[PDB]
Amino acid sequence: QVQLVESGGGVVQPGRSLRLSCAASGFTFSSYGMHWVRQTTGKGLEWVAIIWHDGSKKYYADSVKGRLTISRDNSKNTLYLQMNSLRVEDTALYYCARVGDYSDFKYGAFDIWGQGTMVTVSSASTKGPSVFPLAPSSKSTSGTAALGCLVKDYFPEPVTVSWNSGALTSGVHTFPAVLQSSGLYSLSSVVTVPSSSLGTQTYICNVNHKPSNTKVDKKVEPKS
Amino acid sequence: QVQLVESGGGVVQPGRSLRLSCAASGFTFSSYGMHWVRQTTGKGLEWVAIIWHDGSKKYYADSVKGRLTISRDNSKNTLYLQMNSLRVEDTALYYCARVGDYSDFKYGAFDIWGQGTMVTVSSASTKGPSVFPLAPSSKSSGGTAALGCLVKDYFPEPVTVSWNSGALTSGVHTFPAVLQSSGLYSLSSVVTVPSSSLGTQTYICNVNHKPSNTKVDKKVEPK
Amino acid sequence: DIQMTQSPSTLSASVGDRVTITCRASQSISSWLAWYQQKPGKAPNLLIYKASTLESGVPSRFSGSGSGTEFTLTISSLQPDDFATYYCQQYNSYWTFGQGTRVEIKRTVAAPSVFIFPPSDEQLKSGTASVVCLLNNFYPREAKVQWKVDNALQSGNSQESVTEQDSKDSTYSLSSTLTLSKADYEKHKVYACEVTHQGLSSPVTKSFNRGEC
Amino acid sequence: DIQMTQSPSTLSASVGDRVTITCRASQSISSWLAWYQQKPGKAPNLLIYKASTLESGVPSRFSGSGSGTEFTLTISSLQPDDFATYYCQQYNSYWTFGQGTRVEIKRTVAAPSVFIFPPSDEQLKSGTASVVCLLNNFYPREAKVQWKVDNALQSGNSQESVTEQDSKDSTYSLSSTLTLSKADYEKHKVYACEVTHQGLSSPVTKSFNRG
């Protein structure tokens, strides 16, 4: 019952704005101080801002001062994080957390968190992926073979990669995307099949890219 | 370097004003409450006033209410102390101290202290000293005689005393000055010398009072 | 008004000694107590806060103890830079300081040499008479001086000051000035200053007769 | 600025084991330290606050200890639903977290199945050539891949992705992607990726020649 539901995340280009919203329910929202914490794989969990229960005191991390503004509407149980002049360094998953009301001289134990909302800042424009096959070698049937598809140069995330219209599910490994130096993403999805099935069974990877309305199907055949 | 530098002191007359400064550097001044604490050799260390980190709360000692007001400029990292209707009872060395940030129910530990600035309130005016001799008495009290000079009725501080233009320092005892009932300072300076040298060695105490530009060379001889 | 009383006021010690300073409280202050050290000409420096917590950067030889109304500052092995004055300050209700405790460098007892100087002839011309009594090279600091004029104890018309230990002196010296009007001085004959000190089995008196010495 | 530093960054354990996680503090934070647990795709959950006080809903397995600058988190009996990443944070001066300690499923050692897929002909039209060195179902996570065009190593023209620990076999898979230009691809003959791992007694190298 006690929960915090966030929204407002999205993909924006640097210099633009974005407003995060943290909807509270199950407790007295106007009684708790609130935080925004962001999480990136490179820097881990980083504190962003805190607002007093009534909004009188506000503190910000040094990296977001002047561009980030924490606000609060106690009549609607909403916490806000107005993001201005966004940088690609602001790309992270953003949580809102509640200050645990434990009697002490210091406070900051976060006992309720939101589900997190993702904000992505990049100057890259929407681009569908180009799919290239990873052809297996036809040898040593007596033995398993590896084959897959290279999903290259797409933006933004995510892509749904399925094999044989979702019929092939065993041995499939879809790797996490990598951000290239060009701003585009790259992904590889391989599958381990018995080499004895290479001669007759046909394998097709299905790459669907919703942000570009792109759907690609590539048949992977033994090269040798 | 965490430090506190004070200014604004001086000698003034009763009823006049004086503004003390306490420039802070090396730490975050805006996030610390500050105190003024004065010190005398009679009352000791005495708390004067406290200012909050944002200046929202102020509290003064009973002896300074209405006359002393404490302020703070976070934009310049300086602590102020406005002193009005100054009484002679306000004469002290004034310190500014930072409240230690040690989490507890009460707060009153001072971890950083200024060097101190001196406030002297007195109705007296600048006066040069009178130098009188302390003539040696009968010789052979252990074979050593005592002589000196008495530096009376000067204002303000300080006064320097040497013997034979500095060429006599063994045996010299120059005592701290005392404030007489007249608001004028008096100081004594003595030296111990052999009894056999009283009739054969000249002893001159050199008194210098810069506040009045007074220089006195006083020869002390037995009577 | 919570009053802080320190015991003792003055104590002798050598390098390497264990010194103990007591701080009494007029009422309960829990553990809201601070200890400071002040060297001549310098501001005080905090050593102990919250009765027993040691200030960062302070040598671990210092240690505080106590709660309520009785407190203690301890130096397990006193070092040469520890010769100073120590104040205890409470912060339970407002801020009040102790009278301080001077830590003097210990030496053997030394009786004072007493000298008395009648007023000069040029000061008597001005209308005032100053009689000076000189206590030279005594230890410890505790000493008493009584002015008598024709066997009449003088109170309220004398002042005195003392020297400290320095690189040249292990003892103290005291100068007391009895200030009399010229008319009062000429009215009496015998002027004496009686000195009481630990190094004296009996009070020493030094006198002169007006018009003779 | 108080830096939180946990040790180790990742540890392997089994169900029923006694797991201990220690995180240090650049300054004294007294007992104002909190422990969190985060499973993938989810938000952190408070475990211990005030150094040793247990959160209301957290089971008795978890417990906090230590004070000052050295703190420790301990699980008495490792439950199967306790494989996650654990974070320590201080709230004495602002709010800072540790890098996080991961608790993985310890299994038997397994060498990686190494494959090297040459760039396709469709990508050869674009002018860029991508070679992929695939490592499949290896344990532990620690592994290194070195690209050696001919006999010369490669510095910063390759990226890697590691899958999460599998649900069944509890293994890891790595995908390195070396990206060259077609002018640079058609200029050299030998392309290899050398893989170092505990499963293999000597670095296994899977390679191919242009053509």
């Binding site: 106007s30 009684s31 708790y32 101080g33 609130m34 805190i50 607002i51 007093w52 229960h53 009534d54 005191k57 503190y59 200050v99 009301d101 001289f105 210091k106 406070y107 900051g108 | 805006s30 996030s31 610390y32 409450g33 500050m34 406290i50 200012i51 909050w52 980190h53 944002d54 709360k57 509290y59 409240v99 940030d101 989490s103 129910f105 009460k106 707060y107 009153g108 | 809201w32 912060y91 339970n92 209700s93 407002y94 | 104002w32 709230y91 004495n92 001066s93 602002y94 709010w95």
Partner: peptide, 17 residues
């Protein structure tokens, strides 16, 4: 209470008392 915390404390109680 004059002996209350005179310093700035971002980690003070942000909740309602």
């Amino acid at each position: 209470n004059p002996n209350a915390n005179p310093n700035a404390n971002p980690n003070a109680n942000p909740n309602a008392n």
